[PDB]
């Protein structure tokens, strides 16, 4: 599982044609603020295919 297949799972809005997303900021978390953590209701938007 050499997992160099990172992609994006979550975004605030729909991606427009011919735009690249590079930021690793934490996903939406509308109810509680994540404040820069990967705890409860806090996921990084980068997962691999495996």
């Amino acid at each position: 599982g050499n997992y160099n297949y990172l992609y994006r799972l979550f975004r605030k809005s729909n991606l427009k044609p011919f735009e690249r997303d590079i930021s690793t900021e934490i996903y939406q978390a509308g109810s509680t603020p994540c404040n820069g953590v990967e705890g409860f209701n806090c996921y990084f938007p980068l997962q691999s295919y495996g």
Partner: antibody
Amino acid sequence: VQLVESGGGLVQPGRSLRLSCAASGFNFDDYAMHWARQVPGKGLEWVSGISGNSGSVEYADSVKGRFAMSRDNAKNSLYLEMNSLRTEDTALYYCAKETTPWGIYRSGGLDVWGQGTTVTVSS
Amino acid sequence: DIQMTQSPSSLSASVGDRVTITCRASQSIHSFLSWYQQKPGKAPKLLINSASTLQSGVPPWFSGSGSGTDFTLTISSLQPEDFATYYCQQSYIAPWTFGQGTKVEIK
């Protein structure tokens, strides 16, 4: 504010195994003690929780009636008794404090994380 | 919360048949889902976790897939131990609800 876990080990399913973590560097208050489990390579799962003034005990959806918790503030150590052990409960155990025992808006606790002792169950 | 339902509410099959259990969600569940197996008068057990991973001690003929909203579970061959009721629950957000339950009987 250091949390050191202990009590994890290898044991057959169906047997009891009590784990504990001592609270050090924490000023005494009515902080809601919580427990979180992590399957390795998976997400985060909460287990149970006890708030201040005793009582107020709740568990997760699948551990109702099989987990027992009691809080003793004199020893500054919290223990959980494990009953009806299955092969699913193999995970990494983190015990959290959330450090917000406020009278107004007690919810919204920043759950801290300790070193953590995992458990292994082999059938 | 999340209002969930499962279909069918009951099933009837013999030994060796191919049946499927499907249960969807009203909110985006992606992949974090568990399929419990519980017997009458006994404790539950987990067979498939995260909709794609086979648990330790679980036989490999229980195979599942699904992403987004629609979820499914497939049985290659049925066994004498397989005849029981089945639950599927979500594991994403603020506290979850269980399923109404399906049942497989001898036809």
